[PDB]
Amino acid sequence: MNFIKDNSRALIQRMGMTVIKQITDDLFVWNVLNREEVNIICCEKVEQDAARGIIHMILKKGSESCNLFLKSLKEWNYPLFQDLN
Amino acid sequence: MNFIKDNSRALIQRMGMTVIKQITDDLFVWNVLNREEVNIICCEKVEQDAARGIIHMILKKGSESCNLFLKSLKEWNYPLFQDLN
Amino acid sequence: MNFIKDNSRALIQRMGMTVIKQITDDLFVWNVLNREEVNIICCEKVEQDAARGIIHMILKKGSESCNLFLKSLKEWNYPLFQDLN
Amino acid sequence: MNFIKDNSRALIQRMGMTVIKQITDDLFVWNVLNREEVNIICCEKVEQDAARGIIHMILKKGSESCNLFLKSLKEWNYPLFQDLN
Amino acid sequence: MNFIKDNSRALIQRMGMTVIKQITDDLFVWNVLNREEVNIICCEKVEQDAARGIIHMILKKGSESCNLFLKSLKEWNYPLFQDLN
Amino acid sequence: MNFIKDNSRALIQRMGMTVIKQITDDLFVWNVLNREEVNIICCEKVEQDAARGIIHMILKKGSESCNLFLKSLKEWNYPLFQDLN
Amino acid sequence: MNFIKDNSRALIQRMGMTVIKQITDDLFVWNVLNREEVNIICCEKVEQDAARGIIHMILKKGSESCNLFLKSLKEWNYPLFQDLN
Amino acid sequence: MNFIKDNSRALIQRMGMTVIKQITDDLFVWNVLNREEVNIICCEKVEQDAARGIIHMILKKGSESCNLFLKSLKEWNYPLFQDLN
Amino acid sequence: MNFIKDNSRALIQRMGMTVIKQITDDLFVWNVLNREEVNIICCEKVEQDAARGIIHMILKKGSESCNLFLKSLKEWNYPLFQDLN
Amino acid sequence: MNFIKDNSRALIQRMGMTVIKQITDDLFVWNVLNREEVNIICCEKVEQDAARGIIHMILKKGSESCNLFLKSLKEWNYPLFQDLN
Amino acid sequence: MNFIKDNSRALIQRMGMTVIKQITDDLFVWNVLNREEVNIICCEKVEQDAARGIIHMILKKGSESCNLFLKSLKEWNYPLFQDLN
Amino acid sequence: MNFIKDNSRALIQRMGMTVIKQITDDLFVWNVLNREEVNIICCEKVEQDAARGIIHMILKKGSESCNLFLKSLKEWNYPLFQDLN
Amino acid sequence: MNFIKDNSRALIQRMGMTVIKQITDDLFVWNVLNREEVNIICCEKVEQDAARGIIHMILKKGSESCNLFLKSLKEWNYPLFQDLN
Amino acid sequence: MNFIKDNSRALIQRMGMTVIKQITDDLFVWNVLNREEVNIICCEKVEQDAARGIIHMILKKGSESCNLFLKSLKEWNYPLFQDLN
Amino acid sequence: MNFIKDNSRALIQRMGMTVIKQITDDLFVWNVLNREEVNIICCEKVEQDAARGIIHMILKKGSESCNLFLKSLKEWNYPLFQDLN
Amino acid sequence: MNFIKDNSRALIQRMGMTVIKQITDDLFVWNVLNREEVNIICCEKVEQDAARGIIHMILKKGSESCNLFLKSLKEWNYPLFQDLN
């Protein structure tokens, strides 16, 4: 995805932990991330580090699986994604 | 395996450490890698280096033992293997 | 132990940190693990990594000392060990 | 359980703390969760985090032990489970 | 201390947070634990984790300093220590 | 700063978390620490560890930026800074 | 760059890990460092070692690509770069 | 120092991380360890490994600089040093 | 190749190990280097020595096979190759 | 020693790094290994390689100095040495 | 041995260093290779060179001593020896 | 062979040691070179000298035995032999 | 330098890696060691070997360039250099 | 050259291998030494022997080609050449 | 020396590289071996070969200079020299 | 000796350099070969040539001095001498 890579500087900044545990919920229900790739993200204390944990697991997982993150970002935390565009 | 060799440039890139410790779990349970060939992989810090550690232990171990890696890659980290095809 | 090795793929998955700090309690009281081999396990953040930390310290410690783990798994977290069989 | 996994996005959202301390009561009386796996759940402040604490302790504990959660969800908080179906 | 080590499985279970903040009070007044070794114990949320925090700071601090814990356990929470013997 | 370095043993001891989240407020408003260097400090549980987190981010940030910490310590928690001198 | 080389003794000292993971974010978005040259930096535990990891990847990458580091150092951690001049 | 070397087996065992970050505070204020030799110690996860990190930096730093460690061990964690003698 | 030979003084200097293990990945997938000619390169500790290991295996392998190195250098580590021209 | 040589295949397998840094502690306190012969062992990443590092420094150091290893193996990691016999 | 000689082209290719240090362990315990004939093998950096080091020490050592290598290859690295046949 | 003789100026130049130890592997398995005619080649330090060692042992060994070298050069180091034609 | 040569037995012993990467920082900023003579030092695993790597690059580089090492040893690791005199 | 001949006793002593592989890089780029006259130098293990290998290939190659060595010695390893004068 | 010659079979066996680089340190500080006679010893890969390198440089260097080796062997690696007698 | 002469065709073939430097160690300690008759053997590069160097120095040195070779061949490299009989 070109969108996630170009906005990755702000998506590791303004994202926030309270939506990261909600986005990685929908990424697990849709069988993208397994349980142990959630525990890599959600166990890190700083919200910027868990934001680095998702995005580098998105960009390795194809381009069609980048969408299911971005569909989960337009549902949870829409005012970021409205301002991100 | 022709599949692992041709995709080895991307499989050392998009694989990720969180699944490498999960794939080398199933490779140990199925008696492919012993314990000391897991410690060569999982002790390396960069996730790209542990990805070079598995694949060069796969390609030396036959062709029928390449499958048990690839069966473990369609279970753990399927959105890579879906996008890898 | 043949039982721990064959189920090691699921025992690093469904085990959970809340019982790992309870199993390695009973492994320390029964003088299997010393204190520094508990700190290797319990300091790791992901619950799958501490689960890899116990099991690879069990399989190196004999076969009769594998039982004291498995006796501690039928006391703490029995619904796993009921479903594991 | 396929039911808990597919509805896990909504079950960490609409569940609520007042029933989570009541469901983990029945999970303790039926010897699924011990006391220390209740203290992992009930000590977390946000009701969404304790909801993530139960469900990831259910999915690791077999499939037959997923039912005793779901029997406790049709007794306590039935209007969720009526609307969940 | 042989007594604390042998009962450490139950002392991290039945102890309880409400006495752990009272025992580590008397351990601070008697100059065993400083303030920062109380903050390691009392900031942990689960009462079993703060119980692991005291006991592993007792067993490292000599054998004569194990007594001042045990004198503080026969004053605060005597019905445990009565049933512990 | 010679003042912060010489008193750093007591400033990681008597500082306290309730003022550390107030000092790192004024350090963020004055554009010294960004948001992610606050999350390194304030997410640590022990108040001595967050006190080690500020001071080692002060001493790396110049000498003129050490003052804005010390101006924020004479406003918030003056009875320490009165007794520190 | 003459500026980075002459200040490299202090830039491996006062830089700090919390900005190094933020600078190497902007170095990746601007296509200077790929992902595996971030994992060489950010996986090292000491903040001085990750600071040696960036700067020796800057000085090998041209002189015009030294600027994009220095533009990212005047945005993230400006009080260093103000005091560095 | 003959005292630190002979008790180094127990000083890497019973020391504990909560005092190691307090001893290496006083070792930095007294200009023995610089900042990067603290980051070698305090970034290691196991408390036994950070205890190996101090003592092997003491025994290389003279004999008169071994005292300032031992003066900092009779202030912080005296019940060890009382029982160590 | 005239380009690799003339810039070989800087290509053994500014190249870096983190891209050398990535370039020799693409050189192996495209059947230029076999596995044992990668192990000559990647096992050498200094990044300048592995850079001498690739280039002297390029210049012996034809001129049309020099391109596949240079195509792999415009993909991995482009800011060198941008500044190299 | 006939015991160490005959069991050297399993002692480089089931030993584990967490006890190797504890055995080479007691080997240093008893003046068998100096500091630089510990750094040969403990700096190697794989736990099997540090296990090869001790044993080949034992078998070169006499037969009476093989005992002090074996006394340190019956104290630290007794369930191996119980199962080793 | 006719088997080792005919497969020596692949046994210096697919063998791997992680099993070569494990095979030459069992060759030393069974008194085939002494210590200095292990140091000829295991000190070579490329895994293909240590594989040339074993096999040319096997073929000089009789035919009955070729078996103890091949018994150690059916225990360590069986998926090669399964695919080798 | 007319092909080896005419290209012998470049085959002692661009060949490389890493393939010379691989070609003389296949020349030994096919019973062309014995072991002592490999030790004449592979013990020479410069890769150009071992390249002079093979080719002058090829041209003395018939013309039909020149092919088995050239079949081993189209398998190992094909990009030379592609560019050699 | 007579001072470095006479104390070279202790300077390869008590120096330590954490200051060797800091001394060779200042030796690079002052244009004594280039980058590839740092990679010879800092890539060696044992701290005694990197200490042998600096000192034998000092004694070959003049006598006036021995001072810039010794000025960097009185800034970084002064308690050694205080005890060295 | 009179300068190289008179200082050849010290230039085979204080030169060092890490610059010899860097000087013979620039001697190859400037078409003085071909590849096989580098392999005579750089394959020798002792750094004094490779230093004898360059200088006796300089003094045979004219006097105007002695300069390109000496220009490469004032760029790489200037503190020798500063102290050599 | 009669002692070194008679024990030279075991001193090239049980000595070990980690003390050989420490003994040849003290042999250089005491002006026995120059730098180039250390590089003959320490550059050899097998620890038995560097042990042959010292002893044959001792026996050529007088009998009074054999002592300074043996004084350096009773300081570094005393448990050999205790068992050697 | 009739045994060495009749097996001299295989003893110059299967012997190997790693034991030849170990046999000529024991031949020197027992005052058979002096130092200069070791340097004739061990300086030859091919292991078959050093094997021709020992045996033709054995057969000239009596018959009772042939035994001390053969006693040193039943200690070092016994699996040859077991298969030689």
UniProtKB/Swiss-Prot annotation, chains A, B, C, D, E, F, G, H, I, J, K, L, M, N, O, P:
Annotated ranges, domain CARD: 1-85
The listed locations are: Cytoplasm; Cytoplasm, Cytosol; Inflammasome
PTM annotation: Phosphorylation is essential for NLRC4 inflammasome function to promote caspase-1 activation and pyroptosis.
Q: In which tissues is it expressed?
A: Isoform 2 is expressed ubiquitously, although highly expressed in lung and spleen. Isoform 1 is highly expressed in lung, followed by leukocytes especially monocytes, lymph node, colon, brain, prostate, placenta, spleen, bone marrow and fetal liver. Isoform 4 is only detected in brain.
Q: What disease does the record describe for this protein? A: Autoinflammation with infantile enterocolitis: An autosomal dominant disorder characterized by neonatal-onset enterocolitis, periodic fever, and fatal or near-fatal episodes of autoinflammation. Affected individuals tend to have poor overall growth and gastrointestinal symptoms in infancy, recurrent febrile episodes with splenomegaly, and sometimes hematologic disturbances, arthralgias, or myalgias.
According to the record's subunit comment, the protein's assembly and interactions are: Homooligomer; homooligomerizes to induce formation of the NLRC4 inflammasome. Homooligomerizes following activation by pathogenic proteins. Component of the NLRC4 inflammasome, at least composed of NLRC4 and caspase-1 (CASP1). Some NLRC4 inflammasomes contain PYCARD/ASC, while some others directly contact and activate CASP1. Interacts (via CARD domain) with PYCARD/ASC, pro-caspase-1 (CASP1), NOD2, BCL10 and NALP1 (NAC) by CARD-CARD interaction. Interacts with EIF2AK2/PKR.
> What is this protein's function per UniProt?
Key component of inflammasomes that indirectly senses specific proteins from pathogenic bacteria and fungi and responds by assembling an inflammasome complex that promotes caspase-1 activation, cytokine production and macrophage pyroptosis. The NLRC4 inflammasome is activated as part of the innate immune response to a range of intracellular bacteria.
Free-text comment on this protein's domains from its UniProt entry: In an autoinhibited form the C-terminal leucine-rich repeat (LRR) domain is positioned to sterically occlude one side of the NBD domain and consequently sequester NLRC4 in a monomeric state. An ADP-mediated interaction between the NBD and the WHD also contributes to the autoinhibition.
Q: This protein is called what?
A: NLR family CARD domain-containing protein 4
Lineage runs: Eukaryota, Metazoa, Chordata, Craniata, Vertebrata
- As recorded in Swiss-Prot or TrEMBL, the protein's gene is named NLRC4
Q: Which residues of the full protein are shown?
A: 1 to 85 of 1024
